[PDB]
Amino acid sequence: DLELAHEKAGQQLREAKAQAAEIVEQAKKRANQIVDEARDQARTEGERLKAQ
Amino acid sequence: MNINATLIGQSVAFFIFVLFCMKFVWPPVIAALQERQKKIADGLDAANRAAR
């Protein structure tokens, strides 16, 4: 049971590393989307060359 | 001769068997009891340590 507990701890540890990597990966993907939408808003805001 | 020197004949046999038992019969058997108590104790300690 002690040997099996060390093997289980080895799985729980690496699964937590993988999930933490995916949580930060999705955050970086979300951050990239926010800045690109902000670039399109700032590019569209240029309507002032004619709307004004 | 006839009755009392048997009082020392039996006494000598008694002391010889007691010293033989004390060195070649009792220590080898009591050690196996000491070891098993540790074999069971190590299992209970390992289970608590593995859980924690």
From Swiss-Prot, chain B:
List locations, semicolon-separated. Cell inner membrane
Membrane spanning residue stretches:
12-32
Protein function: F(1)F(0) ATP synthase produces ATP from ADP in the presence of a proton or sodium gradient. F-type ATPases consist of two structural domains, F(1) containing the extramembraneous catalytic core and F(0) containing the membrane proton channel, linked together by a central stalk and a peripheral stalk. During catalysis, ATP synthesis in the catalytic domain of F(1) is coupled via a rotary mechanism of the central stalk subunits to proton translocation.
**Family affiliation:** Belongs to the ATPase B chain family.
Q: How does it assemble?
A: F-type ATPases have 2 components, F(1) - the catalytic core - and F(0) - the membrane proton channel. F(1) has five subunits: alpha(3), beta(3), gamma(1), delta(1), epsilon(1). F(0) has three main subunits: a(1), b(2) and c(10-14). The alpha and beta chains form an alternating ring which encloses part of the gamma chain. F(1) is attached to F(0) by a central stalk formed by the gamma and epsilon chains, while a peripheral stalk is formed by the delta and b chains.
- Protein name in UniProt: ATP synthase subunit b
